[PDB]
């Protein structure tokens, strides 16, 4: 149940990735912007429903206390290994057991907003242990641990 200042600050960094205008709320527009950048394309109705899963007070946006409630609960309720397994399935779009190096580079470039090309190159090179141009599940586990 314990939540350190550092853990809260890390969850705030996740919040601000979506709240790109820094107004303290995540809107359907901001959510859609991130999801589309990663190759998803939800309808406006789907985006509203997604906001509604997190929006505890029903005003149509996610504020940080709502975001933190949801993220701390997910961390508490999920074993660290399942958290990583789930994330791998998120980024393995085809479901073929691999994330291509190009796909991972795109995810990192969009989610690490200040990263340079050289930085993402090092990360990819380190991630793809066997050098086959894919990141498999065992390699993804090595990344996250």
């Amino acid at each position: 149940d314990q939540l350190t200042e550092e853990q809260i600050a890390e969850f705030k960094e996740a919040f601000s990735l979506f709240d790109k205008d820094g107004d303290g709320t995540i809107t359907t527009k901001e959510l859609g912007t991130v999801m589309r950048s990663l190759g998803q394309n939800p309808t406006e109705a789907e985006l509203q429903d997604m906001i509604n899963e997190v929006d505890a007070d029903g005003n149509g946006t996610i504020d940080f206390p709502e975001f933190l409630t949801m993220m701390a609960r997910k961390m508490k309720d999920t074993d660290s290994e399942e958290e990583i397994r789930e994330a791998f399935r998120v980024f393995d779009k085809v479901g073929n057991g691999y994330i291509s190096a190009a796909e991972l580079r795109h995810v990192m470039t969009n989610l690490g907003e200040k990263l340079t090309d050289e930085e993402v190159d090092e990360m990819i090179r380190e991630a793809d242990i066997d050098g086959d141009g894919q990141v498999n599940y065992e390699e993804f586990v090595q990344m996250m641990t």
Binding site: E10, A14, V34, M71, A87, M108, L111
Partner: peptide
């Protein structure tokens, strides 16, 4: 579960960035 997992996955990528910067 799907919505929560998508938010959590982006936090986990940011956690990787922190871990990588430490290594």
């Amino acid at each position: 579960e799907v919505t929560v997992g998508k938010f959590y996955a982006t936090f986990l990528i940011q956690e990787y960035f922190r871990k990588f910067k430490k290594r």
